[PDB]
Scaffold this motif. Structure first.
Motif, mmCIF file in Angstrom:
data_model
loop_
_atom_site.group_PDB
_atom_site.id
_atom_site.type_symbol
_atom_site.label_atom_id
_atom_site.label_comp_id
_atom_site.label_asym_id
_atom_site.label_seq_id
_atom_site.Cartn_x
_atom_site.Cartn_y
_atom_site.Cartn_z
ATOM 1 N N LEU A 179 0.720 -1.070 0.224
ATOM 2 C CA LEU A 179 0.057 -0.180 0.047
ATOM 3 C C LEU A 179 0.965 1.280 -0.093
ATOM 4 C CD1 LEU A 179 -3.073 -0.742 2.260
ATOM 5 C CD2 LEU A 179 -3.060 -0.081 -0.178
ATOM 6 N N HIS A 217 -5.319 -4.191 -7.795
ATOM 7 C CA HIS A 217 -4.377 -3.740 -6.646
ATOM 8 C C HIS A 217 -5.057 -3.767 -5.465
ATOM 9 C CE1 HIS A 217 -1.300 -1.687 -4.679
ATOM 10 N NE2 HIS A 217 -1.919 -0.381 -4.680
ATOM 11 N N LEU A 218 -6.069 -2.880 -5.095
ATOM 12 C CA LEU A 218 -6.614 -2.729 -4.061
ATOM 13 C C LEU A 218 -7.469 -4.033 -3.555
ATOM 14 C CD1 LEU A 218 -8.477 0.855 -4.527
ATOM 15 C CD2 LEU A 218 -6.304 0.228 -3.242
ATOM 16 N N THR A 250 -4.911 -6.422 -2.209
ATOM 17 C CA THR A 250 -4.289 -5.797 -0.691
ATOM 18 C C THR A 250 -4.972 -5.838 0.260
ATOM 19 O OG1 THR A 250 -2.645 -4.603 -2.331
ATOM 20 C CG2 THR A 250 -2.964 -4.115 0.208
ATOM 21 N N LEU A 251 -6.305 -5.281 0.036
ATOM 22 C CA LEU A 251 -7.420 -5.294 1.121
ATOM 23 C C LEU A 251 -7.848 -6.539 1.434
ATOM 24 C CD1 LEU A 251 -9.085 -1.911 0.369
ATOM 25 C CD2 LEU A 251 -7.454 -2.492 2.111
ATOM 26 N N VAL A 289 -14.415 -4.345 -5.002
ATOM 27 C CA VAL A 289 -13.501 -4.409 -4.105
ATOM 28 C C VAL A 289 -14.288 -4.551 -2.575
ATOM 29 C CG1 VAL A 289 -11.995 -2.864 -2.439
ATOM 30 C CG2 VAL A 289 -12.004 -2.846 -5.103
#
Ligand SMILES: Cc1cc2nc3c(=O)[nH]c(=O)nc-3n(C[C@H](O)[C@H](O)[C@H](O)CO)c2cc1C
Length: 357
Positions: A157, A230-231, A234-235, A295
């Protein structure tokens, strides 16, 4: 100094799965510069699950000649192999060989096999090490286990696709593994179906969250652009620790509630797969709300299933320890079945479609 033991036990159990988690959180940048592209998770899952040849062999060798068995050399071997494999992966990830009339990533695959062998063997060689220590130090092990995925996610991040090449990230991974290596040096210096239901549910949930849905994450997420994937990755990796924490503060051992939360998570998983089966354009493609919907859906799927996993773990641990052993067995069997089931659907029949940006 009982609490220094707890800090060491946390930082020692942390490294039990940190290499695979760092790899999967950096993966949103490793794809798009390799020949494979959107197919890469489909292999990376079956490889990681075939790497379950490790724990089977360790159990065979424990049963055959337990006299020769020595645990601390085994664990030092595992941690040193982890560190060297990370330093190598720093340099040998993008190398590609011309074999079999085509480009292939052989170094990536075999090094992932080695990392997965190390982390899969850690799962079974790390528990009987805490059996000799105090029992009051057994829980912070689980805190370290849960937070195994938080720091690679935070480095990613701060990275943010870049800010710095994957080489520096993998070197940071090597340094973290070196710190775990240093820390481990100090520790030695009615009807019967009611139980089968919980084992079957753990197998099912781990098949859903380890083998099946990770295998098609590209088709599901990357269609909205790079930042969505990406998000989402990662999340979804950060959301498992906090799920465990909320489980630790507000726990419920009732079977009906955990089952209903499992059904809700599986409905979210069905929504995760339904957009994958609809690439290159899912619903609300190229739309503001679409990316936040995907997401949020990944975050909620991962959280509501990680909470269920942790609470089934608490139930099993309060029953007995053979419970935990068979828990590991069912987790591994379910993950394997999920990957094997999703391999010929994705790769041979080609039901899922790719996209151009
Ligand atoms: C592709 C992939 C496969 C994984 N497989 C397992 C697994 O089989 N068993 C496990 O305990 N954790 C697995 N994990 C990690 C798990 O989600 C997380 O690290 C938990 O903290 C494990 O305790 C896997 C993670 C990824 C990204």
């Amino acid at each position: 100094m009982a609490f220094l033991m707890h800090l060491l036990v946390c930082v020692f159990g942390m490294g039990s799965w940190v290499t695979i988690n760092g790899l999967w959180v950096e993966l949103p940048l490793l794809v798009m510069e390799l020949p494979e592209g959107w197919y890469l998770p489909s292999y990376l899952t079956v490889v990681i699950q075939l790497a379950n040849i490790g724990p089977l062999l360790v159990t065979l060798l424990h049963h055959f000649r337990p006299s020769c068995l020595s645990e601390v050399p085994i664990i030092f071997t595992l941690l040193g192999v982890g560190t060297v494999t990370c330093i190598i992966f720093a340099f040998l990830w993008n190398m590609t060989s011309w074999v079999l009339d085509g480009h292939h990533s052989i170094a990536f695959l075999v090094l992932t096999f080695f990392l997965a062998l190390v982390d899969c063997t850690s799962s079974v060689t790390f528990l009987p090490f805490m059996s000799r220590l105090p029992t009051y130090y057994l829980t912070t092990f689980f805190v370290g286990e849960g937070l195994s995925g938080l720091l690679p996610a935070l480095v990613a991040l701060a990275q943010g696709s870049a800010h710095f090449s994957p080489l520096v990230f993998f070197l940071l991974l090597s340094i973290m593994m070196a710190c775990c290596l240093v820390a481990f040096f100090v520790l030695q210096r009615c009807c019967p179906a009611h139980l089968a239901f919980i084992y079957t549910l753990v197998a099912f949930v781990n098949a859903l969250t380890n083998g099946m849905l990770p295998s098609v994450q590209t088709y599901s997420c990357l269609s909205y652009g790079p930042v969505a994937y990406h998000l989402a990755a990662t999340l979804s990796i950060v959301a498992n620790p906090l799920a465990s924490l909320v489980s630790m503060f507000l726990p419920n051992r009732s079977l009906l509630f955990l089952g209903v939360l499992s059904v809700l998570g599986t409905c979210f998983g069905g929504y995760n797969m339904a957009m994958a089966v609809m690439s290159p354009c899912p619903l609300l493609q190229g739309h503001w709300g679409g990316e936040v919907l995907i997401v949020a859906s990944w975050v909620l799927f991962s959280g509501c299933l990680s909470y269920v996993k942790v609470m089934l773990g608490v139930v099993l641990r309060d029953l007995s320890r053979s419970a935990l052993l068979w828990c590991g067995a069912a987790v591994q069997l379910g993950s394997l079945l999920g990957a094997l089931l999703m391999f010929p659907l994705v790769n041979v029949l080609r039901l899922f479609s790719s996209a151009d940006f």
